[PDB]
Design a protein around this ligand. Structure first.
Ligand code: BCL
Ligand code: BCL
Ligand code: BCL
Ligand SMILES: CC[C@H]1c2cc3[nH]c4c(c3C)C(=O)[C@H](C(=O)OC)c4c3nc(cc4[nH]c(cc(n2)[C@@H]1C)c(C(C)=O)c4C)[C@@H](C)[C@@H]3CCC(=O)OC/C=C(/C)CCC[C@H](C)CCC[C@H](C)CCCC(C)C
Ligand SMILES: COC1=C(OC)C(=O)C(C/C=C(\C)CC/C=C(\C)CC/C=C(/C)CC/C=C(/C)CC/C=C(/C)CC/C=C(\C)CC/C=C(\C)CCC=C(C)C)=C(C)C1=O
Ligand SMILES: CCCCCC/C=C\CCCCCCCCCC(=O)O[C@H](COC(=O)CCCCCCCCCCCCCCC)COP(=O)(O)OC[C@@H](O)CO
Ligand SMILES: COC(C)(C)C/C=C/C(C)=C/C=C/C(C=O)=C/C=C/C(C)=C/C=C/C=C(C)/C=C/C=C(C)/C=C/C1=C(C)C[C@@H](O)CC1(C)C
Ligand SMILES: COC(C)(C)C/C=C/C(C)=C/C=C/C(C=O)=C/C=C/C(C)=C/C=C/C=C(C)/C=C/C=C(C)/C=C/C1=C(C)C[C@@H](O)CC1(C)C
Ligand SMILES: COC(C)(C)C/C=C/C(C)=C/C=C/C(C=O)=C/C=C/C(C)=C/C=C/C=C(C)/C=C/C=C(C)/C=C/C1=C(C)C[C@@H](O)CC1(C)C
Ligand SMILES: COC(C)(C)C/C=C/C(C)=C/C=C/C(C=O)=C/C=C/C(C)=C/C=C/C=C(C)/C=C/C=C(C)/C=C/C1=C(C)C[C@@H](O)CC1(C)C
Ligand SMILES: COC(C)(C)CCC/C(C)=C/C=C/C(C)=C/C=C/C(C)=C/C=C\C=C(C)\C=C\C=C(C)\C=C\C=C(/C)CCCC(C)(C)OC
Ligand SMILES: CCCCCCCCCCCCCCCCCC
Ligand SMILES: CCCCCCCCCCCCCCCCCC
Ligand SMILES: [Fe+3]
Lengths: 273, 40, 20, 320, 265, 44, 44, 44, 44, 44, 44, 44, 44, 44, 44, 44
């Protein structure tokens, strides 16, 4: 009951698992059963990250890298110093993200809201699971996963991308990039329009939604509306995440080779060649 | 449609057109088989 | 995770595949 | 059974709304209006009307000129063959002048003159479009947030096309006009300057692009989940706090321990979106002009990994 | 490339942006503190002092001559809520003492909104029955919804649809008027109403289907429809009344039946 | 057998059937064009 | 057979048929042009 | 033959017909200019 | 025949005609300038 | 004829005309600067 | 002691405890499978 | 003791138990397949 | 000393304490397993 | 047993069944085309 | 003549004219600076 | 001095202090484990 209106909303119920067992708050944070699971998994994952780092060549936070086992090890559980730490941290991260989704669902139920936020975050959880669980399983080795390091997973991204020639020629990658760019443009437009509506110039009063409609019809000839903009932004962000997961999952499992050669299909269409 | 009579007339037309379509496709497939069989 | 050990997988890749 | 606020079940149709009157001297809206039923499923079905002042006319004419120049150069590159045009469209490109010309404004038309002309007309069109968004905001008494957000993207665009080539004195550093060609330019730019991953401003721009995707996902999901309480009517919630604003704040306060307001969330979104292109333009401008090898620069600042930190040979081998 | 020692231009730019971003985060937190602050104690309700980095209060110039808003001056909620803590701790939930839907607790809670209706830019009431709108009609290929049966959360037929309320600014249906068996007319949010018999896939499907065309409201039961908050003036709904109706329907997803508040187990 | 039309609308069924038939026919013709054996245009 | 015009609108069927037939003819002519055997313009 | 007008919009029909005619004519001219046999600009 | 102006608004028709003619003239001049035989600015 | 001004506002017509003239003049001056024959700034 | 049931409900505690026991048992079994000494499946 | 069914819904308990049993059985079968000793499909 | 229970409720305190104890115990056991000296499973 | 039609609408059931049969048949035909033993178009 | 001020606002026309003049002057000065012949800053 | 409790709530102060102490102690122990001089698990 910190916020001036918070107290009346802090009621029992809305939990999926646990009921009244963990139905309480700790400061601003609601816990629930999935909050307990999130706390355990996330704290264990962080502690194991730092335990594996202490066994590594450096404690520099830039250069800390918890690496997966070698490809020759296949899909077996490796020794902790030889990639097992990475596997345990991956399991902890999966559990933590799933528990975060379920805690968001419980909090949505407590406030009389639908499950839009848990589903939206579950899209990103699916992207991560595709990156570090599904793709290594399909490829046959845990060594295909990206390392747990701030700058070494960028090295993983670079090397995996260049293993296919130029990763820019992946068409699902093109679609995901288009969704990302359109999302950022849409977010700029939506934030700017709302702020300009509530922060007028020239000493005028706060505007109505008719003013936003008029502004975007004078600008580009069309206005999507107040509900439509949030629908479109959610669609764009979720599509960006989902198509990122799809684009990475098919490279190395379904498509092997240079993505540049794929576009030789276009030149062979009998309509123009 | 709604009554059995309209449904029967629609079925008559559909069956006639389907039979004509199948006959044309059969002639085409027979000509192709005579030209280049796909079962050696 | 599979039912094998990492050492067994590495030995199989080296000897049974990369050595013969 | 439960409505999920994804598609509008029943649409309301009526006479087209021509907009609130302008507070300045405007010529008058071109009353070309339409109605799209399928757009009304997601948002508003009304198309139009449109405003075409001096700025809109200039922008449309100069952008048409630039696009015509690029397309006619594509047609010439295809040998005027429509089939070759279709076959090689992704590979057609209007390329910048070669390094032997420096940053000279006088290049033969087929060697880069058309490229310079198209860049000039495109820049004129983009700048007049920015001026048009500024004047459209001014005509309604609204704020200038959208003009500044557009100015950030224009800053990145101008750094890519004119400012950086001007500072280096090399037209050949500019981005070619082509689908696959500008991707090739992106890849080559990363390759010649070490590795653009280690540009700290490229990393910052990635941070803000990722965060904008995150922010739009969270904000759209929250607003749609708050449709039961009029969450999408954000202007009225900002100027008169309802239960939708309270629930939206409390959800994120209970999730992560802190929250924004219905107005503050849009400031967060605006700043993330703007900072993406701001940091991107800053990082591109200093590449080559200030730093020529970003991996060396990262090595000097103790954040460049080696093989003893992580060896990517296995990941490469898996992907072959 | 170095400015002095190992300091260079790129490093200077990065440090400048890092400082600017810290300042921007502080500014964004200041903006986020404008609603609901200062904080208060969970039990005693004692108000916390306030941030050292706060500035001035924000004043909104309202349209239609409604004055100024000043969100920092919004009256704090009453400390005495109609509930009792499950256990005596600062983090325990409140169990409502009576009817949460009537008293406004948890998902059924409402805010003290303005007691006048929202207006269009020219001053007309924004949310009005579709007859009072300015030539606004339902899409001809869309469900008419007038006279359709209404299903409640307990699968009972509470009544029928007698009127449609639309937003004159956004051109959207906001409320459906439902006449119940007892004859009382109540407003139900369109966001809690599922329209059946109008599926896009079913229209695409080449079938002749006599699906029942009705409106399902699974938020509240048929009896609860008799306790929907009423309007002070016919044809007009205020912001406070809108919040009341929306809170009453939204709280039903937890409070319509006891099982809705219980874990799956 | 005629009673099928009491369940499926004839207009929509015909439209969907013809769209599917067009897609299938174009797919088969393009597949045949791809093959060296059944290509009827490149060689005499 | 003539009863077809009781289930399909002629004013839309004609437009759709003509557009599709034009696209088909364009595609076939382009395919023929793409082959050396049937190209009627490149050589005398 | 004249019975195609009391139900077909002469405006839309003319607009679509002229758009198609322009597209076809430009396509055909561009094909002839791409051929060495029929190009009328590069050589005397 | 003048009756064409009963079906077509001449403001829109004139705007579209002048835009299309400008595009066509620019295209033709560009094509001519692209050829060595008809380029009139490169050499004396 | 002066009657042209009964259908087109003189302000809009003048604005569009001068915008088009600006684009044309800039294009021509740029093309002239692109050629060594007509470039008046590179050499004496 | 039994008084622990005055602050925690048996129905929810049993579910939470069994979930934790399941995860712990799976972790221990997988750890045993990763060692050559205790792996019971790879070799005889 | 049937007391359990007074506090746990039989339907939910059965669904959860069968989901867990399915996941466990699939995991064990996949683990057995992964090993050469117990794989029953690759070799005779 | 007992007055600590005047400021912290037993339920949340016990939950947090056991979460922390679980995290710490798992961390220490994993760290011991990662070292050759204290690995009790790999060798006899 | 006809009683199943009490619990299922045969219109949507038939639509879903036909969609599934189409997907299965196309998958099987494509898989057969993939194999060199059962490919029937590449060679005689 | 002076009647041009019946159709164009003096404020808007003046602002637009001065912005255009600024852009043109900057463009011409930049072009002159870019030439060796007219550069006035790099050599004496 | 005891008067510090008139400005700071003991519950919030103790929880903040212990979270900080935990993080600092874990940081120090992890730093010591990294160095071979102070590592107490790798060697005898
Ligand atoms: C080596 C191949 C031969 C050749 C072999 C054949 C064969 C075989 C056939 C044709 C037929 C046609 N040929 Mg030929 N043809 C050749 C070269 C040409 C050339 C050229 C550039 O040299 C042209 C312009 C044509 C033109 C034509 C058309 C008149 C006709 C197909 C149009 C049609 O009726 O269906 C389109 C159907 C419609 C209903 C048209 C729709 C009406 C539209 C909507 C209104 C007009 C608007 C606009 C013009 C539409 C055009 C736009 C584009 C097509 C998309 N041929 C070469 C020399 N040609 C066909 C024919 O005789 O048709 C009766 C035919 O069977
Ligand atoms: C091999 C490839 C390189 C790489 C090379 C580059 C280069 C080079 C650049 C980036 C840039 C970026 N990179 Mg990178 N990048 C790499 C890998 C990544 C990865 C990853 C692997 O996950 C990610 C997330 C990114 C992400 C990003 C973005 C954050 C950033 C551009 C975003 C943007 O604002 O949109 C793009 C938005 C614009 C371009 C603004 C456009 C606005 C204008 C006004 C629009 C005009 C449109 C016009 C009117 C339309 C008509 C035109 C006519 C038809 C012609 N890169 C690797 C290391 N990357 C850019 C940057 O700024 O970073 C420092 C950049 O220049
Ligand atoms: C070479 C180093 C020496 C060593 C030298 C020293 C020296 C010197 C000192 C200690 C001290 C401590 N050492 Mg020692 N210590 C060593 C190895 C160990 C090992 C082991 C490897 O198993 C353990 C478990 C410990 C344990 C401890 C603690 C009992 C004690 C810190 C008290 C404290 O307040 O914790 C902090 C934790 C809390 C306040 C929270 C309570 C913890 C509960 C269980 C919750 C855990 C939280 C969870 C894991 C994660 C949450 C993190 C945040 C809250 C978000 N040492 C090695 C052998 N050790 C210090 C001491 O005696 O202080 C009194 C001290 O000065
Ligand atoms: C539409 C897809 C996009 C998306 C959606 C989005 N993100 C979201 C949400 C949504 C809708 C949330 O509701 C959720 C949230 O609650 O934010 C406040 C969240 C979130 N997005 C987050 C991060 C994030 N999202 C990302 C991406 C995206 N988010 C997308 C592009 C990225 C990228 C691109 O990498 C980042 C880093 C967090 C701020 C939050 C998720 C909070 C969470 O998961 O809680 C668990 C608690 C923890 C303490 C974390 C677990 C700790 C681990 C066990 C240890 C670390 C393991 C890790 C694998 C180490 C590797 C790191 C290295 C790569 C450096
Ligand atoms: C309009 O409505 C909206 C708002 O306000 C009304 C919003 O605020 C928002 C939210 C948005 C913002 C406030 C803007 C800022 C957000 C950004 C940049 C994106 C998120 C990124 C971040 C880095 C923020 C921080 C993210 C986190 C995950 C931090 C989480 C931290 C912690 C400590 C979580 C702890 C909680 C748990 C583990 C669960 C509970 C368990 C416990 C308490 C453990 C108990 C046991 C012990 C031992 C203590 C949205 C989206 C919105 O739409
Ligand atoms: C959603 C995913 C659920 C996965 C199962 C799970 O999340 O397991 C839970 C935690 O596992 C964890 O985070 C740690 C998981 C580690 C995986 C490796 C088990 O929690 P509880 O037994 O209730 O309480 C543990 C007691 O100490 C009380 O605090
Ligand atoms: C890769 O494979 C390739 C190479 C592509 C080969 C594959 C190709 C394939 C699979 C193609 C398949 C094609 C196909 C498969 O059915 C085509 C069918 C075409 C048909 C049915 C054409 C029909 C045309 C009918 C027409 C034009 C009728 C017009 C009638 C009109 C306009 C009548 C008007 C009227 C008249 C006169 C009198 C007035 O008073 C009133 C009114 C009554 C209005
Ligand atoms: C490929 O490209 C290259 C290489 C360039 C080759 C091709 C080039 C091509 C195709 C170019 C084509 C060009 C073209 C093709 O028509 C040009 C036409 C130009 C024309 C028609 C120009 C006309 C100008 C008229 C002007 C300036 C009139 C101004 C009048 C004014 C300002 C009057 C104001 C007034 C006054 C005083 C008094 C008031 O009481 C009334 C009022 C009225 C207000
Ligand atoms: C992998 O892929 C490769 C390598 C290709 C291998 C695999 C290939 C596979 C799996 C292919 C499968 C194909 C398939 C699987 O069913 C096809 C079925 C086709 C069917 C049922 C076609 C039916 C056609 C019927 C037609 C055309 C009927 C038309 C009727 C009409 C138009 C009637 C009108 C009417 C009239 C006159 C009078 C009025 O008074 C009443 C009224 C009624 C209005
Ligand atoms: C580049 O960076 C490097 C390399 C580091 C070089 C540069 C370093 C630089 C620039 C550093 C600059 C540092 C700096 C520049 O000012 C520091 C200033 C520090 C100061 C002012 C510290 C002051 C501390 C005061 C303290 C701890 C007071 C505590 C008082 C307490 C807790 C009192 C409590 C109370 C009590 C008992 C009784 C109650 O009745 C009343 C109440 C009051 C509640
Ligand atoms: C159908 O056929 C027709 C011909 C009718 C239409 C054809 C249409 C087609 C097919 C068009 C296709 C266009 C495509 C595919 C374009 C793709 C472009 C892409 C991908 C571009 C990407 C990036 C481009 C950038 C960043 C460009 C920036 C350029 C700038 C900023 C240039 C500035 C130049 C200036 C300021 C001019 C200076 C002039 C000077 C120096 C002389 O004086 C100051
Ligand atoms: C309650 C449901 C929680 C999970 C919803 C789905 C998450 C995203 C799956 C892709
Ligand atoms: C909103 C919940 C109450 C917040 C009180 C903060 C101080 C007490 C926190 C207690 C945490 C559990 C017990 C100590 C470990
Ligand atoms: Fe919003």
């Amino acid at each position: 009951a910190l916020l001036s209106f918070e107290r009346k909303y802090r009621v029992r119920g809305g939990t999926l698992i646990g009921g009244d067992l963990f139905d309480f708050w700790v400061g601003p944070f609601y816990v629930g059963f999935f909050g307990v699971t999130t706390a355990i998994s996330a704290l264990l994952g962080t502690a194991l990250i730092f335990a594996a780092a202490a066994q590594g060549p450096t404690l520099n936070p830039w250069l800390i890298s918890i690496n997966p086992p070698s490809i020759e090890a296949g899909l077996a559980f490796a020794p902790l110093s030889e990639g097992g730490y990475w596997q345990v941290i991956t399991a902890c991260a999966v559990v933590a993200f799933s528990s975060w989704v379920l805690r968001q669902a419980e909090i949505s139920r407590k406030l009389g809201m639908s499950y839009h936020v848990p589903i939206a975050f579950g899209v990103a959880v699916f992207a991560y699971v595709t990156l570090n669980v599904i793709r290594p399983l399909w490829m046959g080795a845990w060594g295909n996963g990206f390392p747990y390091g701030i700058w070494t997973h960028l090295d993983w991204v670079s090397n995996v991308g260049y293993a296919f020639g130029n990763f820019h020629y992946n068409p699902v990658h093109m679609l995901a990039i288009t969704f990302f760019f359109t999302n950022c443009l849409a977010l700029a437009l939506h934030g700017g329009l709302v702020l300009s509506a509530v922060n007028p110039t020239g000493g005028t009063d706060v505007k109505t939604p008719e003013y936003e409609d008029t502004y975007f019809r004078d600008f580009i000839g069309y206005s999507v509306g107040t509900l439509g903009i949030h629908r479109v932004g959610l669609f764009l962000a979720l599509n960006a995440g989902f198509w990122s997961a799809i684009c990475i999952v098919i490279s190395g499992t379904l498509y092997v080779g240079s993505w540049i050669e794929f576009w030789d299909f276009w030149k062979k269409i009998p309509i123009w060649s | 449609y709604l009554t059995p009579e309209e449904a029967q007339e629609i079925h008559k037309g559909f069956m006639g057109t389907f039979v004509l379509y199948v006959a044309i496709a059969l002639v085409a497939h027979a000509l192709m088989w005579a030209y280049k069989p796909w079962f050696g | 995770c599979s039912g094998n050990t990492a050492s067994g997988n590495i030995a199989a890749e080296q000897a049974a595949q990369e050595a013969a | 059974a439960t409505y999920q606020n994804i598609f509008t079940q029943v649409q309301v149709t009526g006479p087209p709304e021509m907009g609130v009157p302008h507070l300045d001297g405007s010529e008058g809206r071109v009353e070309l209006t339409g109605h799209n039923y399928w757009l009304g499923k997601i948002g508003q079905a009304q198309i139009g009307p449109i405003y075409l002042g001096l700025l809109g006319t200039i922008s449309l004419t100069f952008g048409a000129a630039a696009i015509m120049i690029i397309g006619l150069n594509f047609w010439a590159q295809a040998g005027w063959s429509p089939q070759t045009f279709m076959r090689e469209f992704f590979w057609l490109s209007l390329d910048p002048p070669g390094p032997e010309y420096g940053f000279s404004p006088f290049v033969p038309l087929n060697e880069g003159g058309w490229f310079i002309m198209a860049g000039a007309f495109l820049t004129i069109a983009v700048l007049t479009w920015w001026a048009r968004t500024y004047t459209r905001a001014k005509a309604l008494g609204m704020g200038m947030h959208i003009p500044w957000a557009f100015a950030s993207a224009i800053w990145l665009f101008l750094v890519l096309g004119f400012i950086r080539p001007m500072l280096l004195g090399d037209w050949s550093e500019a981005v070619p006009y082509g689908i696959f060609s500008h991707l090739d330019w992106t890849n080559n730019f990363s390759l010649r300057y070490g590795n653009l991953f280690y540009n700290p401003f490229h990393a910052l721009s990635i941070v803000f692009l990722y965060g904008s995707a995150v922010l739009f996902a969270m904000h759209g999901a929250t607003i749609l989940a708050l449709g039961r309480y009029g969450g999408e009517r954000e202007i009225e919630q900002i100027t008169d706090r309802g239960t939708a604003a309270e629930r939206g704040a409390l959800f994120w306060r209970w999730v992560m321990g802190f929250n924004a307001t219905f107005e503050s969330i849009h400031r967060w979104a605006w700043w993330f979106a703007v900072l993406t292109t701001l940091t991107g333009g800053i990082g591109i401008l200093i590449t080559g002009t200030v730093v020529d090898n970003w991996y060396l620069w990262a090595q000097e600042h103790y954040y460049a990994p080696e093989t003893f930190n992580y060896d990517p040979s296995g990941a490469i081998a898996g992907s072959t | 490339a170095y400015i002095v020692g190992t300091f260079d231009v790129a490093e200077l730019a990065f440090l400048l942006f890092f400082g600017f971003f810290i300042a921007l985060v502080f500014y964004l937190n200041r903006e986020s503190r404008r609603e609901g602050y200062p904080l208060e104690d969970e039990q005693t309700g004692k108000i916390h002092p306030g941030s050292l980095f706060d500035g001035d209060k924000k004043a909104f110039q309202l349209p239609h001559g409604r004055g100024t808003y000043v969100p920092e001056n919004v009256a704090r909620d009453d400390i005495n809520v109609p509930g009792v803590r499950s256990f005596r701790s600062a983090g325990a939930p409140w169990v409502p003492t009576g009817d949460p839907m009537k008293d406004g607790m948890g998902p059924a809670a409402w805010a003290n909104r303005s007691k006048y209706p929202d207006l269009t830019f020219d001053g007309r009431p924004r949310i009005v029955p579709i007859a009072q709108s300015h030539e606004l009609i339902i899409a001809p290929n869309d469900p008419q919804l007038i006279g359709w049966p209404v299903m409640a959360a307990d699968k009972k037929m509470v009544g029928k649809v007698s009127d449609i309320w639309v937003d004159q600014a956004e051109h959207m249906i906001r409320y459906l008027e439902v006449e119940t068996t007892t004859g009382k007319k109540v407003l139900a949010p369109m966001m809690v109403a599922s329209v059946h018999g109008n599926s896009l896939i079913d229209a695409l499907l080449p079938i002749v289907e006599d699906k029942p065309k009705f409106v399902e409201i699974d938020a509240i039961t048929a009896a609860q429809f008799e306790d929907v908050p009423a309007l002070e003036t016919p044809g007009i709904i205020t912001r406070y009344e809108e919040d009341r109706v929306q809170a009453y329907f939204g709280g039903g997803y937890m409070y319509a039946m006891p099982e809705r508040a219980e874990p799956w187990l | 057998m005629w009673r099928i039309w009491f369940y499926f609308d004839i207009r929509r069924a015909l439209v969907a059937l013809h769209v599917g038939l067009a897609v299938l026919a174009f797919t088969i013709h393009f597949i045949l064009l791809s093959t060296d054996r059944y290509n009827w245009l490149e060689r005499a």
